[PDB]
Symmetry: C3
Subunit: 125 residues, 3 copies
């Protein structure tokens, strides 16, 4: 069974995709960007932007019968790898106890010209 996930506490998915999709115990979360649930961009520091991305992921996971503690793998895409040090401070605050596998890469550009995008693969609770 493939089950799409929708929450009002993350920016809405466009017509062609879902915020997350569940398949046999796994939860695949779409790449989250620094936008509020009302679909407005977060302006400010990378730290503020990272915190929004984390809240977006967390809320989609909660709707997926999952949580940060059930994440298996995180992929981080940064528009500028110079921002990695700052991003990592926020990342470490969230993954203080649970330590999923991770990959981080510097990309040329991201949707809507944002500074970061983060996708996650998790398991159901």
């Amino acid at each position: 069974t493939l089950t799409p996930v929708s929450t009002k506490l993350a920016p809405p998915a466009a017509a062609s995709y879902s915020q997350a999709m569940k398949a046999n115990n796994f939860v695949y979360v779409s790449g989250q960007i620094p936008y509020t649930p009302d679909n407005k961009p977060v302006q400010g520091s990378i730290s503020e932007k990272a915190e929004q991305v984390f809240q977006n992921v967390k809320n989609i996971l909660a709707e997926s019968n999952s949580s940060l503690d059930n994440i298996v793998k995180v992929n981080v895409f940064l528009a500028d790898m110079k921002n990695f040090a700052e991003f990592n401070s926020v990342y470490a605050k969230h993954f203080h106890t649970h330590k999923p596998a991770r990959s981080c890469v510097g990309v040329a550009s991201l949707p809507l010209n944002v500074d970061l995008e983060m996708e996650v693969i998790a398991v159901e609770k």
Copy 2:
């Protein structure tokens, strides 16, 4: 069991990889590029190029006992994010009913200097 997949209706894999690999109900499809099954590049619009990538994915999925409707997650890599609007028109045509999770990023370069690469994770029918 890990089962490699081969179809003559997508560009052939090189010696070191498989077009797709199956593992416990999941199908992992290699990143598909805008090349025809005869291994020639598609020249033309991003729309034409995206349509070829979609046909490549669809045909590999069919050989994998899967289909577009069984996709869990799509990752789109674009050489230029300015092409995203055009790409999205084609994407939305295919994912008109089934809405997998998605991530899209702008990369510096792609194999054989192509404009787009798309990988997919699916489940068996």
Copy 3:
């Protein structure tokens, strides 16, 4: 059950992540870079750098009750796609018999300004 993996025969993970994480038969390996297990960068040819990345992945897999022969999907990120030909020679040497699915993309930058990063998804033996 989510089980983190640690080996002394790959560069140590930082505090916020694990070298690999196991979840229901799958092993998700963090993106490996050309650093030795003593956390020093490999200087030299792309071939030498690729060989180090391969040894890092192999050793994490071994600690994960897996191996190269149990890999389902490989994602290769290169800081310069001009290095792909050279990388591929090393890749083909390792995947001489087992042929997982693969995606390869050229990125803007990688952690610690390295030339390549490779992540892998595998199954347990």
